[PDB]
Design an enzyme around this catalytic site. Structure first.
Site, PDB file in Angstrom:
ATOM      1  N   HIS A   1     -15.608  -4.598   9.946  1.00 25.57           N
ATOM      2  CA  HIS A   1     -15.359  -4.064   8.595  1.00 25.57           C
ATOM      3  C   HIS A   1     -15.613  -5.129   7.758  1.00 25.57           C
ATOM      4  O   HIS A   1     -15.450  -6.376   8.065  1.00 25.57           O
ATOM      5  CB  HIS A   1     -14.037  -3.612   8.560  1.00 25.57           C
ATOM      6  CG  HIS A   1     -13.557  -2.809   7.507  1.00 25.57           C
ATOM      7  ND1 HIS A   1     -13.173  -3.402   6.248  1.00 25.57           N
ATOM      8  CD2 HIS A   1     -13.644  -1.505   6.921  1.00 25.57           C
ATOM      9  CE1 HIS A   1     -12.988  -2.371   5.000  1.00 25.57           C
ATOM     10  NE2 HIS A   1     -13.395  -1.484   5.722  1.00 25.57           N
TER      11      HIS A   1
ATOM     12  N   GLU B   1     -14.001  -6.432   5.341  1.00 26.80           N
ATOM     13  CA  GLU B   1     -13.067  -7.452   4.870  1.00 26.80           C
ATOM     14  C   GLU B   1     -12.566  -8.377   6.002  1.00 26.80           C
ATOM     15  O   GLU B   1     -12.421  -9.656   5.863  1.00 26.80           O
ATOM     16  CB  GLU B   1     -11.625  -6.448   5.073  1.00 26.80           C
ATOM     17  CG  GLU B   1     -11.333  -5.828   3.631  1.00 26.80           C
ATOM     18  CD  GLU B   1     -10.478  -4.717   3.560  1.00 26.80           C
ATOM     19  OE1 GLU B   1      -9.666  -4.301   4.454  1.00 26.80           O
ATOM     20  OE2 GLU B   1     -10.752  -3.621   2.819  1.00 26.80           O
TER      21      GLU B   1
ATOM     22  N   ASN C   1      -8.803   4.890   7.739  1.00 22.47           N
ATOM     23  CA  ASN C   1      -8.706   3.381   7.948  1.00 22.47           C
ATOM     24  C   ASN C   1      -7.516   3.002   6.872  1.00 22.47           C
ATOM     25  O   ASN C   1      -7.584   2.680   6.010  1.00 22.47           O
ATOM     26  CB  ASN C   1      -9.729   2.481   7.667  1.00 22.47           C
ATOM     27  CG  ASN C   1      -9.485   0.976   7.785  1.00 22.47           C
ATOM     28  OD1 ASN C   1      -8.528   0.554   7.976  1.00 22.47           O
ATOM     29  ND2 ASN C   1     -10.417   0.287   7.303  1.00 22.47           N
TER      30      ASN C   1
ATOM     31  N   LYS D   1      -5.830   0.370   6.935  1.00 22.63           N
ATOM     32  CA  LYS D   1      -5.803  -1.087   6.687  1.00 22.63           C
ATOM     33  C   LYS D   1      -4.087  -1.736   7.027  1.00 22.63           C
ATOM     34  O   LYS D   1      -3.480  -1.283   7.965  1.00 22.63           O
ATOM     35  CB  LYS D   1      -6.248  -1.307   5.331  1.00 22.63           C
ATOM     36  CG  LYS D   1      -7.549  -0.783   4.975  1.00 22.63           C
ATOM     37  CD  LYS D   1      -8.286  -1.208   3.830  1.00 22.63           C
ATOM     38  CE  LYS D   1      -9.449  -0.444   3.489  1.00 22.63           C
ATOM     39  NZ  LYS D   1     -10.092  -0.775   2.340  1.00 22.63           N
TER      40      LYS D   1
ATOM     41  N   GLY E   1     -12.726   0.187  -2.038  1.00 16.39           N
ATOM     42  CA  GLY E   1     -11.396   0.088  -2.965  1.00 16.39           C
ATOM     43  C   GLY E   1     -11.812  -0.205  -4.456  1.00 16.39           C
ATOM     44  O   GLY E   1     -10.761  -0.670  -5.036  1.00 16.39           O
TER      45      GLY E   1
ATOM     46  N   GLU F   1     -20.763   1.160   4.207  1.00 15.76           N
ATOM     47  CA  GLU F   1     -20.024   1.027   3.224  1.00 15.76           C
ATOM     48  C   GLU F   1     -20.413  -0.276   2.301  1.00 15.76           C
ATOM     49  O   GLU F   1     -20.214  -1.381   2.718  1.00 15.76           O
ATOM     50  CB  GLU F   1     -18.670   0.544   3.653  1.00 15.76           C
ATOM     51  CG  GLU F   1     -17.956   1.347   4.648  1.00 15.76           C
ATOM     52  CD  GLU F   1     -16.570   1.053   5.168  1.00 15.76           C
ATOM     53  OE1 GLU F   1     -15.995   0.337   5.619  1.00 15.76           O
ATOM     54  OE2 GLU F   1     -15.824   2.341   4.719  1.00 15.76           O
TER      55      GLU F   1
ATOM     56  N   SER G   1     -14.568   4.325  -1.678  1.00 21.76           N
ATOM     57  CA  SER G   1     -13.914   5.068  -2.632  1.00 21.76           C
ATOM     58  C   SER G   1     -14.397   6.460  -2.396  1.00 21.76           C
ATOM     59  O   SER G   1     -14.506   7.297  -3.447  1.00 21.76           O
ATOM     60  CB  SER G   1     -14.401   4.452  -3.892  1.00 21.76           C
ATOM     61  OG  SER G   1     -14.123   3.151  -4.351  1.00 21.76           O
TER      62      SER G   1
END
Lengths: 250, 250
Positions: free
Chosen positions: A95, A97, A11, A13, A173, A167, A213
Site C-alpha cells: 500500500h 502508505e 481497508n 487502516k 484520502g 490507487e 476516494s
C-alpha cells in the site's frame, strides 16, 4: 464481454474501537448481498479476532493490512505463517502508505507478494503514481515498472492468487477521485501488459481494482468501465455506505 | 540498599501459534510466584486477544511489541489509542530490530516514548551499542545519547512510567550474553546520568533491565548486581524455563 468476479475491499487502516467495530460489523451482517462479489474486510492486527468472532455475512473474508514473509526475531511485526495459523489467508501488500512511510521499495513489495503466493494467500497488491509522476506524463512507466517488479518474482500459476489495486497516490484520502476515464485508461494499460507478458488467459481473469476516494455516489460510474473490477476503499469503508459501494458492483 | 520492584519481561517477537501459545500460557498460569515482581508478556498483535483470554497469573500484564502514537491513515500499523481501548497499557519501544530493520532513529523512538507516556502507558524503552561501537570504546557515549534523546521529550513526572532495557546489540539472540560485570558498569553509568540530569529520587526508583541472551542459568548472577532490576528475554521466554528466569529475581 464478461467481467471476472468483482471485489469490494474495506481497508480500515489504523482505525477502530471495539465498540465502533461491533456496530459496523452488525451493519455488514444485516446487509443481504444478492450478486456474486467477494467482499473483503481488513482490520488492524489487534481486531482480527474480534471481527472473526462477529462477522457472519457469507460474502466476506478477512484480510491483514500487511505482513512479513517469515516468523522469527522481528519485534513488532506479524508474519504470514502466523496469520495462516489464525485463519487469515488474504493480505494487502505494498500500500502507498507503506511504500512512503515505512520504506517498502518495489523489491521489498515483490518479495512479500511472492512469499505470500507461495504460502497460499490471496494477495491484494497495490500500485500507483504520485501527482508529480502524473504531471510528468510518467503514469504508464511507473505503474508498469511497479507491476513487472512483482511479475519478475512470480510464476504463471501464482497469478491466480493476485489481485492488483491501482490507487493514484493523489487520490488516496484526498477527496480527489480519479475520473472513470482516467482510471479506465490505466486499467486497460495494465490488462494489456499482463495479456502480453504473462498470458491472455491470465489477463481475462485478473481482477484490477480502483482505489482512492471511492464513495457510494461515484462507485457505480467507475464500475461501469470495462476494465475496473471493483474497489479498495479506505475512508468510506468505516461507514454504513460501504453497503452501497458493494451494491454498485452489480 | 533496597532495589525497586523487578520486572521479568517476555518478548515473544514474531513467533507463536495458537496451539503453542495455549500450552505456554498454561505453564505460566500454573507457576506460583511468591515474591514481588512485575511479569510482562509481549505477544504479537494478533495473539493479544488469545493471551488476554487465557492468562490468569496475577503477576502478569500484557505488552505490545511496538505501536504508533495516533490512529489514522497508516495501513498496517497499530496505534496507542487502539491498544488502550482493548486493555493493553504497556508497550516496548525502540527495540534494536526496529531501529535496524524498520528505520526507527533516536528521534522517532523519543517521540513514540513521549506520546506513550502522555497516553498513560508503561513503556519499556530499549537502548544499547553495537559490537563496533563497543570495540571503539563508544559504549557510554552511545547509550547516553540514546537515553538523553528520550529524556529531552519527557517531563520529570513521566519517568514514573518509563523502564529502560539495556540490550547490547551483539548479545541479542547470539548466545553471547554480557558478563554481570559488563552489564553492571553500563547500568551504573545510566543510573548516575539519570540521578544527575533528572533527579536522585527518579534514579532510585528507575528499573533498568538487562536483555540479550538471558537464560535460566545466567539470570541469577546478573540479578545479583546492584543496578540490574530484571530482564527483557527473547528466545528463552518461549520456553518453560522462563519460570526460573522469573524466580531468579528473588
Amino acid at each position: 464481454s464478461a467481467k471476472p468476479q468483482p471485489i469490494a475491499a474495506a481497508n480500515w487502516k489504523c482505525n477502530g474501537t471495539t465498540a465502533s467495530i461491533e456496530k459496523l460489523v452488525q451493519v455488514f451482517n444485516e446487509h443481504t448481498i444478492s450478486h456474486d462479489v467477494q467482499c473483503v474486510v481488513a482490520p488492524t492486527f489487534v481486531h482480527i479476532p474480534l471481527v472473526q468472532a462477529k462477522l457472519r455475512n457469507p460474502k466476506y473474508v478477512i484480510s491483514a493490512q500487511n505482513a512479513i514473509a517469515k516468523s522469527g526475531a522481528f519485534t513488532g511485526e506479524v508474519s504470514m505463517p502466523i496469520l495462516k495459523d489464525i485463519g487469515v489467508h488474504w493480505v494487502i501488500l505494498g500500500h502507498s502508505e507503506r511504500r512512503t512511510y515505512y520504506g517498502e521499495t518495489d523489491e521489498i513489495v515483490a518479495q512479500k507478494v511472492s512469499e505470500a503466493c507461495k504460502q497460499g494467500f490471496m494477495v491484494i497488491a497495490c500500485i500507483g503514481e504520485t501527482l508529480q509522476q502524473r504531471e510528468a506524463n510518467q503514469t504508464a512507466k511507473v505503474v508498469l515498472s511497479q507491476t513487472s517488479a512483482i511479475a519478475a518474482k512470480l510464476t504463471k500459476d501464482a497469478w491466480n492468487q493476485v489481485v492488483l489495486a491501482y490507487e493514484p497516490v493523489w487520490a488516496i484520502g484526498t477527496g480527489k477521485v480519479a475520473t472513470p476515464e482516467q482510471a479506465q485508461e490505466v486499467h486497460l494499460l495494465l490488462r494489456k501488459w499482463v495479456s502480453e507478458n504473462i498470458g491472455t488467459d491470465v489477463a481475462a481473469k485478473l481482477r484490477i481494482l480502483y482505489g482512492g476516494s471511492v464513495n457510494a455516489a461515484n462507485a457505480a460510474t467507475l464500475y461501469a468501465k470495462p476494465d475496473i473490477n471493483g474497489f479498495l476503499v479506505g475512508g468510506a469503508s468505516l461507514k454504513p455506505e460501504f453497503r452501497d459501494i458493494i451494491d454498485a458492483t452489480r
